[PDB]
């Protein structure tokens, strides 16, 4: 029958590791680097697009940064197709929660659910895992600003600053070096760009190769605001920090 | 070579053999010996029971299917429990719906068809048991032999199990004698016990060792064990 062709995606190695989770994690280590930094007055999400092209439209494009809620957003590393499947269910979950409780979903609850869907493809069903690592950026009235990460294993953790994708080891060492607790958003924007610039496999870090977003509390509004940086705005902030 | 074609029942060998079926047939040959034989009036099962220790009971080889039909087993006993249970329901259905005692010929057809479906489906194994079915219906005394391949044969007499070739030669040589034992149950049991001892080599057939069953014209299917078989020793 079919038994001859089954890869057995959900079995342990003699060492106690899950083959497909390990191999999917190896896939992500090749994907464009994404960086999240949490500050006292907001959160930064930065991501490096891959390779690029002259004709590749940057205006309509948004491949690595996604809006999940009015208060939650994600940076993606890995297969975009796999990510969009998980992104949609997360979008539905936040709306189900809002319909039930008349309150916006707390950030951890949303993360835990997605991290549970991923865990499933790890344990039953005989399908391959999602080749995706997420960085979650959010706000709620319980824990305020929050930064989480999740990977194909279904494991999630909380962070002050974190990186996913390529060269995370080199990126984490640099963040571990320059990050402090009483940081401001505008300082965090700088750290994110400097880190990406130092870990790039490309020549010069340019605007057409970056996606940038902030979750800041309105400097006069009092409400929480999401800002996906438009091509021209990143071009500006790249001269600010001093990379031209 | 062979290791490639014995993985499942779904696979044919290059010469056209079904090894999983053939391996199931081996469970029968490893099983304890049992014999069946008939005349025109009666049909008789004789079985040698096997134990594990001198502290264990002897495992039963004969199972009642209805008031007019039963069988003896050789091989996997749980499989025989499955197949005897099925034959109990089929006998039960025929009575409740048609008020009819199930014919021993279609009794064998139902067993054949049920075993066949396991030899063609993926994931299923073949049954690992041989069966000797005796009966008395509207056409007199009947004896059947069942193989896990699905093949079922009507016979005057036969034997299955270990060393069963000894008994089968005896019955083949004494055919004309026992076929005429009409109206005498005891002289048919005699011809059955003498047949089974032709297959003994190690032990002597004893009081808790021997198992006998009978069915016929004015005899419902009844099992004889223990001290009830002592007179045939």
């Amino acid at each position: 029958g079919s038994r001859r062709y089954d890869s057995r995606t959900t079995i342990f190695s003699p060492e106690g590791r899950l083959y497909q989770v390990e191999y999917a994690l190896e896939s992500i280590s090749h994907a464009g680097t994404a960086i999240g930094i949490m500050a006292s007055d907001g959160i930064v999400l930065a991501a490096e697009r891959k390779v690029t092209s002259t004709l590749l439209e940057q205006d309509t494009s948004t491949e690595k940064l996604y809006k999940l809620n009015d208060k939650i957003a994600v940076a993606v590393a890995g297969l975009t197709a796999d990510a969009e499947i998980l992104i949609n269910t997360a979008r539905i979950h936040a709306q189900n929660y809002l319909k039930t409780y008349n309150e916006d979903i707390p950030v951890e609850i949303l993360v835990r659910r997605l991290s549970d869907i991923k865990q499933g493809y790890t344990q039953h069903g005989g399908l391959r895992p999602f080749g995706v690592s997420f960085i979650y950026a959010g706000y709620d009235d319980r824990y305020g600003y929050q930064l989480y990460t999740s990977n194909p294993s279904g494991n999630y953790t909380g962070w002050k600053a974190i990186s996913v994708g390529a060269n995370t080891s080199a990126a984490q060492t640099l963040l571990q070096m320059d990050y402090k607790d009483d940081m401001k958003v505008d300082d965090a924007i700088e750290l994110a760009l400097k880190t990406l610039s130092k870990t790039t496999d490309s020549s010069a870090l340019t605007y057409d190769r970056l996606e940038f977003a902030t979750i800041r509390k309105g400097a006069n509004d009092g409400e929480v605001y999401q800002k996906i940086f438009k091509p021209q705005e990143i071009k500006d902030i790249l001269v600010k920090t001093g990379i031209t | 070579f062979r290791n490639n074609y014995d993985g499942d029942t779904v696979t044919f060998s290059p010469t056209g053999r079904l090894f999983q079926v053939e391996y199931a047939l081996e469970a029968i040959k490893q099983g304890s010996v049992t014999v069946g034989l008939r005349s025109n009036t009666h049909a008789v099962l004789v079985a040698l029971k096997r134990n594990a220790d001198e502290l264990s009971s002897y495992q039963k080889k004969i199972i009642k299917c209805d008031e007019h039909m039963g069988l003896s087993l050789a091989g996997l006993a749980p499989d025989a429990r499955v197949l005897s249970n099925y034959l109990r329901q089929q006998c039960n259905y025929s009575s409740l719906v048609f008020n009819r005692k199930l014919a021993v010929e279609r009794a064998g057809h139902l067993l054949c068809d049920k075993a066949q479906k396991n030899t063609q489906s993926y994931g299923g194994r073949p049954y690992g048991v041989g069966l000797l079915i005796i009966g008395y219906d509207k056409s007199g005394a009947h004896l059947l032999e069942f193989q896990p391949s699905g093949n079922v044969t009507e016979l005057y007499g036969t034997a299955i199990g270990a060393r069963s070739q000894g008994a089968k030669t005896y019955l083949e040589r004494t055919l004309d004698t026992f076929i005429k034992i009409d109206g005498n149950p005891d002289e048919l049991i005699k011809a059955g016990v003498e047949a089974i001892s032709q297959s003994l080599r190690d032990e002597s057939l004893t009081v808790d060792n021997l198992s006998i069953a009978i069915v016929g014209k004015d005899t419902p299917f009844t099992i004889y064990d223990g001290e009830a078989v002592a007179k045939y020793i």
């Binding site: 001859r4 | 779904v10 044919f12 056209g16 054949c112 063609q120 391949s149 089968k168 019955l171």
Partner: protein, 244 residues
């Protein structure tokens, strides 16, 4: 690397299904059976190997009836043949239930043909280990068919399969030449005994039991009926006489 023969639905590099070819091998190992189409009906005969004197004569019937007008005989794995007839029986009852009329033979042939072909489409099933010779009488003429493990079938003037198929065919071809306008039902039964006795040289080490059936417009009223007693003994003597 090869192993194209290990799974059913698989094509070999030369376009073959090796599992079907291996099923054919089980048929050739089986007992010989035949079919002879006459001027208004059909005659079926089969060899029955007497392994032991312990086998009750006239009791292990191999020829089967579908409906009231069709006869079936097969060589190879018997249980498979029994399975196929149970299907033939269901398929015919269904046809009668809807269309009132008893199933025409060409219609019945295709029903078995589509069923056997289905068992060569999936690796989760094993091909049928039988060639089936069958036919009967419908609203226009008499029909004879042979169905292969592949699902292939054609109409025949005469059909043979099993152990002595070569001997039978050679004999059947001489009948087609000597009787161009047709053979009678009485004559076909007698001649069917002759073919089986001549084909038995392939298993000449063991004794055998003859079994004949016929379905003829004027001889059986277009119904399937077994040949018994006087007519059978007449056919047996005809074969016994024409052997020296």
């Amino acid at each position: 690397g090869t192993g194209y023969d290990l799974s059913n639905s698989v094509f070999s590099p030369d376009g073959r299904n090796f599992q079907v070819e291996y099923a054919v091998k089980a048929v050739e190992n089986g007992t010989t059976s035949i079919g002879i189409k006459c001027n208004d009906g059909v005659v079926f005969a089969v060899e029955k190997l007497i392994t032991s004197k312990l086998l009750v004569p006239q009791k292990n019937v191999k020829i089967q009836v579908v409906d009231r007008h069709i006869g079936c005989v097969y060589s190879g794995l018997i249980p498979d043949g029994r399975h196929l007839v149970n299907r033939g029986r269901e398929e015919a009852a269904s046809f009668k239930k809807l269309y009132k009329t008893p199933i025409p033979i060409p219609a019945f042939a295709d029903r078995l043909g589509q069923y056997v072909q289905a068992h060569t489409l999936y690796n989760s099933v094993r091909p049928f280990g039988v060639s089936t010779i069958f036919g009967g009488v419908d609203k226009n003429g008499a029909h004879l068919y042979m169905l292969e493990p592949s699902g292939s079938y054609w109409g025949y003037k005469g059909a043979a399969t099993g152990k002595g198929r070569q001997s039978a065919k050679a004999e059947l071809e001489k009948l087609v030449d000597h009787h161009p306008e047709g053979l009678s039902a009485r004559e076909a039964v007698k001649q069917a005994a002759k073919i089986i006795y001549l084909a038995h040289e392939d298993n000449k080490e063991k004794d055998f039991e003859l079994e004949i059936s016929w379905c003829s417009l004027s001889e059986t009223n277009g119904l399937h009926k077994f040949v018994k007693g006087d007519l059978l003994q007449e056919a047996i003597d005809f074969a016994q006489k024409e052997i020296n």
